[PDB]
Design a protein around this nucleic acid. Structure first.
Ligand SMILES: [Zn+2]
Length: 252
DNA sequence: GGTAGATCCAGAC
DNA sequence: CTGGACTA
């Protein structure tokens, strides 16, 4: 799921778990557990705590308990569901939080790429994976000035810059390609080569693209198909080690 | 320090 | 071969 989907999850999941008390934590793929390193310590500390809130930072979910916060990233295919302890688990269920009311919060992930970290609430923001996380793309903290500052000081491509979680929080590949198309900028352009005009335009399109989503595609996954603005075939290459889609006419 | 490469997974290829 | 976010 991308940032807008994660926000939807935050909003919809909260009422399904708020006020419930953890009675057990069951782990079927311990590699998902990143802190404490020991999955047994992760499980033990959460028992007895009540879910008090659910926040999002970038594509991370932050479950707020009594003493601890659980920081969860779903990566490509992670998913949460709340269901009865009486029913069989769905395939690829790797972590289950069992509540005292006989319900469960289940984490599924066919790819097993997702991660979980638990720390005392007051430590969460200063430890991985939230430490160093850049500003929310929809916040005043993410501004053209901030983007400009990062762009001038690097030798990387503009696409590489936008994918950097320290630059802006949770801006995914799809939205990078879409934003760059809408801003008229080739993804392989060195970030430092962007004019102040291009930086402003790019920031504008970034906010608009992800903002719209939180509330069709021009290039992403459309390689070989005509551009919706000019009819030129969309092309796909590799930039910043990722599948990259662009129109060679609209983008410069 | 900056930046690329290293890496985990399993399904599609 | 592919994706997001320690090491050298
Ligand atoms: Zn075009």
């Amino acid at each position: 799921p991308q940032l807008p989907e994660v926000e939807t999850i935050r909003r919809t999941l909260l009422p399904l778990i708020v006020g419930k008390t953890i009675e057990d934590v069951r782990i079927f793929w311990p590699n998902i557990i990143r802190h404490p390193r020991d999955s047994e310590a992760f499980a033990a500390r959460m028992i007895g705590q009540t879910v008090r809130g659910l926040e999002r930072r970038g594509k991370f979910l932050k479950f707020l308990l009594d003493r601890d916060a659980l920081i969860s990233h779903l990566r490509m295919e992670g998913r949460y569901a709340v269901a009865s302890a009486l029913e069989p688990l769905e395939p690829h269920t790797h972590v289950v939080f069992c509540f005292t009311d006989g319900s469960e919060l289940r984490y599924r992930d066919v790819r097993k790429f997702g991660t979980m970290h638990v720390y005392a609430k007051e430590e969460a923001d200063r430890r991985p994976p939230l430490a160093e996380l850049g500003p929310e793309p929809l916040s005043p903290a993410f501004s053209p000035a901030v983007l400009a500052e990062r762009a001038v000081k690097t030798k990387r491509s503009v696409k590489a810059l936008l994918l950097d979680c320290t630059v802006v929080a949770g801006f995914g590949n799809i939205y990078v390609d879409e934003s760059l198309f809408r801003a008229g900028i080739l993804p392989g352009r060195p970030a430092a080569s962007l004019s102040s005009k291009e930086i402003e335009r790019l920031h504008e399109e970034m906010v608009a693209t992800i903002g719209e989503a939180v509330m069709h595609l021009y290039v992403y996954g459309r390689q070989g198909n005509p551009c919706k603005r000019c009819g030129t075939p969309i092309e796909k290459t590799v930039v910043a080690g990722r599948g990259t889609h662009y129109c060679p006419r609209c983008q410069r």
